[PDB]
Design a protein around this ligand. Structure first.
Ligand SMILES: Nc1ncnc2c1ncn2[C@@H]1O[C@H](COP(=O)(O)OP(=O)(O)OP(=O)(O)OP(=O)(O)OP(=O)(O)OC[C@H]2O[C@@H](n3cnc4c(N)ncnc43)[C@H](O)[C@@H]2O)[C@@H](O)[C@H]1O
Length: 214
């Protein structure tokens, strides 16, 4: 099963990607996670994103498509994968087309723009795993620590109010067009498209998703 998650910054994509992964055994390929990791390792493919992500901007398509093709080539992806954060632009969606990567489901997480900045200021992450928490909406079982490893949670560098605003504008300009792109793909019979209400509580969003996927 191959799934794309689509949605504005902070719509809950990464939070739901951990449930789909654990419940359906398909790997989560998250380009934000792969790029923060590359920046942190000084990996030649991806360390270049450091300043772009800091500014709230999209990294070049050519770079991100290279990372994703590499990852899909690892033996875990031969039986499905979940794309979280990719495609992010119409060139990245076309590249998937050209390459024979068709998906089963595209899920749009809809959230109003006005909720995004407070979701993101309460966000705390366990960086090694990419697990994400919210101090109010979805807190860890022990404050400040990841549930699994007991390691201290941190804040992302690009999760301040002005970088989020910048990210919202780039989302509306470049990424929002993918809703029409893939809705056209669903019309043609090439994928299934399902929209979910990302304002519902985390567990409730989790339950709508089980109705769509099995
Ligand atoms: N393909 C690509 N092309 C080019 N550049 C690329 C690229 N991919 C990445 N990049 C780059 O990397 C940068 C950042 O990219 P990004 O891909 O956005 O990495 P991100 O910040 O980790 O995640 P998102 O902004 O997408 O939020 P999300 O929808 O996953 O929601 P989450 O579950 O955390 O939820 C948010 C918060 O709210 C919470 N929450 C979740 N669900 C709910 C709910 N139902 N109710 C209430 N609160 C909730 C969470 O606990 C959390 O605290 C970009 O600016 C760009 O530079």
């Amino acid at each position: 099963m191959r799934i794309i998650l689509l949605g504005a910054p902070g719509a809950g994509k990464g939070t739901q990607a951990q449930f789909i992964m654990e419940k359906y055994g398909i790997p989560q390929i998250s380009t934000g996670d792969m790029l923060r990791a590359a920046v942190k390792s000084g990996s030649e493919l991806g360390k270049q994103a450091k300043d772009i992500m800091d500014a709230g901007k999209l990294v070049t398509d050519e770079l991100v498509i290279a990372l994703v093709k590499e990852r899909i080539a690892q033996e875990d992806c031969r039986n499905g994968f979940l794309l979280d954060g990719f495609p992010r632009t119409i060139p990245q969606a076309d590249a998937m087309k050209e390459a024979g990567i068709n998906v089963d489901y595209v899920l749009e997480f809809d959230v109003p723009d006005e909720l995004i900045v407070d979701r993101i200021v309460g966000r705390r992450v366990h960086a090694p795993s990419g697990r994400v928490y919210h101090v109010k909406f979805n807190p860890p079982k022990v404050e400040g620590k990841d549930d699994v490893t007991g390691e201290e949670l941190t804040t992302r560098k690009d999760d301040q109010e002005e970088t989020v605003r910048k990210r919202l504008v780039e989302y509306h300009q470049m990424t929002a067009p993918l809703i029409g792109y893939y809705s056209k793909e669903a019309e043609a019979g090439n994928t299934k498209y399902a929209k979910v209400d990302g304002t519902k509580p985390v567990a409730e969003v989790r339950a709508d998703l089980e109705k769509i996927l099995g």
